[PDB]
Amino acid sequence: SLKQFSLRVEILPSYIPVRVAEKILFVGESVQMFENQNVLKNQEDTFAAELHRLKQQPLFSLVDFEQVVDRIRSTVAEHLWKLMVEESDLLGQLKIIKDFYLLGRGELFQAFIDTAQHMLKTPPTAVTEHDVNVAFQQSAHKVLLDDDNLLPLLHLTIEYHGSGWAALGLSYKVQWPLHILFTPAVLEKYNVVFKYLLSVRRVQAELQHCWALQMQRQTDAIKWRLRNHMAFLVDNLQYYLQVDVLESQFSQLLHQINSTRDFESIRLAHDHFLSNLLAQSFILLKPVFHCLNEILDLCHSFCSLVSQNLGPLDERGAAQLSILVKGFSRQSSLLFKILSHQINSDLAQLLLRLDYNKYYTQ
Amino acid sequence: REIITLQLGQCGNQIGFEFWKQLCAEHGISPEGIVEEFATDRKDVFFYQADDEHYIPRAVLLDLEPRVIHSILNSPYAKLYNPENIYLGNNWASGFSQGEKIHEDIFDIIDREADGSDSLEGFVLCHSIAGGTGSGLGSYLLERLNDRYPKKLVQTYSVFPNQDEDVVVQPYNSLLTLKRLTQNADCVVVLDNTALNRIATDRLHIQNPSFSQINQLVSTIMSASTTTLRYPGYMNNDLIGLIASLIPTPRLHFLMTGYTPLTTDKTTVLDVMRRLLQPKNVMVSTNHCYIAILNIIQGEVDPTQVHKSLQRIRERKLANFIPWGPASIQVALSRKSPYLPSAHRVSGLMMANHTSISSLFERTCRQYDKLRKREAFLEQFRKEDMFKDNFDEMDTSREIVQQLIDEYHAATRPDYISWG
C-alpha cells in the first residue's frame, strides 16, 4: 500500500482536472489504509445512490463531480483526524520528537555530552554503538526524572567504515497511524537538524570548561582569556539564535494542528513547521554553514590548547593562538558582513553583536 | 550541582538569614521547612531534600563572639535551617587568628554537607568586608577553600562598606581582605552601604534605621541574582554558564548591581531596560566604560519584543562602553513566582563588569595610604603585632590592589591585548 497506487496523467481525461482526481486519490488511499489492518457509517449505498443518480444524467457536469468527491473527501478526513489526534494523541508525540531530535531536553543532552565525552571523541568502530546507548541510558537516569516506558522508543545509531561524534544518528520508532505522517524521509530531515544542534551545544559546554580553568588559576593565561572570551561571544549568540526559532516555530506548529479538524491541515502544519525550522538554522545555505562550522572547529583546537596545561604555554601554541585570534577575527567579521528573505530573527540577531559595534568599528 | 552558602560574621549572618527567609516565602516552604499546602521550580540546587518535605537549605552559619546568632536561633525559622552546624575582635588579624584555631571543625562542617549532597559546585559567601570578626576569618576561610577544592569555584557577595567613613582600622581591614579576594576569589558581587543608603533616602524617608531596611534591598538583589538558577530556563541553567559572560578576566571579577523598579512595591521591556541603564537604578556609589553587561527580567514579558527591545536600547546607547572585551548585552528572562505579590508585573535586575568600581577600591586605598603614612592606627595590639611584626602583608596587599587598579584602567585603554 501507499505504492502501486498513483495517478496516470497520460490516461486522465482532459475535461476532468487534476485537482479533483487528487481528491479521488486521497479518499481512495485513506479508505485503503484504514480498510486493512482491521483483523464506517454506511453512506456506501447513499453515495452509490448519489453516483447512481449521477450515472443517469446524460451530460457530464464537472462541478457536480467536484462536489460529490469533496463531500466524500472531507468526511473521510474529518474522521481520520479524530482517530489520530484523540485516540493516538499527536501532541505528545511531537513533544517527544522536539525533546530529543531538536534538543528540547537540556538537562539530559548536556549530561550525555558530559558523561560520554571521551568515547564519542574516540573514532568509530563496531562496538561503539552499544557503548553510547548504555551511556545515554545512564544519562537518562543521571537526570533522574524518569517515568515508565518513554525510553524504548529511542536509541543511538553509530555507523563505522562508511571522531565518533560525526556518525551519531538518532532514530524513533513510530506507530502505525503516524506512519504516513512520519515517513523515513522526514525523520531523515530531522536527523540533520539533530547533528547540527548537538554540535553547537557541545562547543558551548567545553568552552566554559576553559573559562572555569582560566578563572581558578602570568601572561599567556590572560591572552587565552581574551581568546576564550572573544570566542565565547559569538558562540552563545549563535545558539541563542537557535533558541529563538525553536520557541517561535514550534508555537506556530501546535497552533495550526489545533486550528481545524481536517487531516489535511495537520499535514500542512508539519510542512510549514519544517520549512521554517530548516531555514532559520541556515543549513540549506552553503557558505554560511561552510564558515560557521570551522568557527566552532577552530574553537575546538583553541579549547584543547588551554586544556593542555595550567602552566603558561609558549611552546609553539602562542604562534598559532595569535594566528587563531586573527583568523577568528577575520571570519566572524566576514559573517557579520553577511548578516548585515530579510527575516526578523536573522537581521535582529546582528545588533546584539552591533550593540558594541565591536567588529564594525574594527 | 548543589550550592552551599558560607554565611559568616554578624552582618553576613544577618543577610544570609534574610536571604533564606525570602527564599522560604518565594518557594513553597513554611517557617518549619515543611512543604506548603497551598503550592515548578528547581529547588534541588539551593535546598536539601529531607524525606518529610523539610526543605532545609545548605546554610553554614559561623559565629565568632556571637550576639546576633542567638537572635537568629530564637526565630520561627530556626527549624527551617536545621543542619546543626553552628560552631562557637574588631580587627582583621584577630578574626584571622581566631579562625585558625577552629579551622578543622568548621572545615569538617563543610565536609559533612559536601558528602551529604549528591554533588557540590560553588561556595557562595555572605562576606562582610572590614566586618570585624567577619573580615579576617572570611579571608582565611577563602584561602582554605580553594586549596581543598581546586576544581571548585567561590562566589563572594561582598557588602563593601562605605558609610561616608565607627572602625578606625577599616581601611587596613578592607585592604587585607581585597588582596585575599583578588587572588583567591573566583567571583565577587559588590554592594555599597552608601549607595543603598542613598537609595533608601530616595525611595523612602528612612535614614536612622539604615542597616535594618537596607537588609531588604540587599536581599532582593541576592534573590533576583539567583532566580534564573532557582527556576528552569533555556540558557544559564547553571551558575558557571552564567558567571562566564560576566567575568572576562579573572582579576576584574567584581560585579555591579541595579534594579529597574527600585519601588517594586504594565511596563514593556524597552521601558525597563532603558530605566535600568540610568544611574539612579544603579546601586553602586579619563574615559570609563563597562566591560560586559547582562540583564535578567522576570514577569509578563512579550517574546517578539525582547529582540526589538535590545534593538531599541542599542539605538538609545544609554550605556557607554569601548572595552577590550567583545561581550555585548543580551536580553535574558526568568520566571516570576506565584503566591507572592506580582506588583510591578515586569521587574528586572542587571549585573555588569564596569570600571568605576576601581574608584571605590581606590577610595579605601587612599584612606589606607593616609592612615599608613600617619601610622595613627597600626593598632599595636599584641595580637596585631605578634601576628604581623613586619606589617608587610599590608604592603603586599597594597601592591596587589594597585595592580588591580592599574588593570582596570588598562582595561579602559585600547590595548588590554598587551600587558595588564
Author numbering:
A (entry chain K): 253 to 291, 300 to 422, 448 to 502, 509 to 631, 636 to 657
B (entry chain Y): 3 to 41, 45 to 93, 101 to 177, 180 to 279, 287 to 306, 313 to 447
Provide excerpts from the study:
Upon recruitment of the terminal γ-TuSC unit to the GCP2(3)-facing side of the assembly intermediate, the conformation of the γ-TuSC(3,4) unit is locked in a manner similar to γ-TuSC(5,6). Different from γ-TuSC(3,4) and γ-TuSC(5,6), the terminal γ-TuSC(1,2) unit is already integrated upon its initial binding in a conformation that matches the structural organization in the fully assembled complex. In this new, ‘locked’ position, the γ-TuSC(13,14) unit can directly bind to the γ-TuSC(1,2) unit by virtue of the MZT1-GCP3(14) module, which stabilizes the γ-TuSC(13,14) unit on the complex and thus may prevent it from dissociating again. This indicates a two-step mechanism for completion of complex assembly and ring closure, involving first, positional locking and, second, stabilization of the γ-TuSC(13,14) unit by γ-TuSC(1,2). In the second step, γ-TuSC(13,14) is stabilized by direct binding to the γ-TuSC(1,2) unit, preventing γ-TuSC(13,14) from dissociating and at the same time physically closing the ring. Formation of the lumenal bridge specifies incorporation of the terminal GCP2-GCP3 unit and thereby leads to closure of the γ-TuRC ring in a left-handed spiral configuration. Structural features of the cryo-EM density indicated that all GCP variants have been incorporated into the complex in the correct order and that the lumenal bridge was formed correctly, including stable integration of actin and two copies of MZT1. While the MZT1-GCP modules may play a role during γ-TuRC assembly by providing extended intersubunit interfaces, we could observe these modules not only in assembly intermediates but also in the fully assembled complex, indicating that their association with the outer surface of the γ-TuRC is not merely an effect of an incomplete assembly process.
The gamma-tubulin ring complex (γ-TuRC) is the principal microtubule nucleation template in vertebrates. Microtubules are formed de novo in a process termed nucleation, which is spatially and temporally highly controlled by γ-tubulin complexes, composed of γ-tubulin1 and associated γ-tubulin-complex proteins (GCP). In most eukaryotes, microtubules are templated from a preassembled γ-tubulin ring complex (γ-TuRC) that determines the position and direction of microtubule growth. Here, we used cryo-EM to identify and characterize γ-TuRC assembly intermediates after recombinant expression of the complex, which allowed us to delineate a comprehensive stepwise assembly pathway from a stable 6-spoked core to the mature 14-spoked γ-TuRC, identifying successive stabilization and conformational locking of γ-TuSC units as central principles in the assembly process.
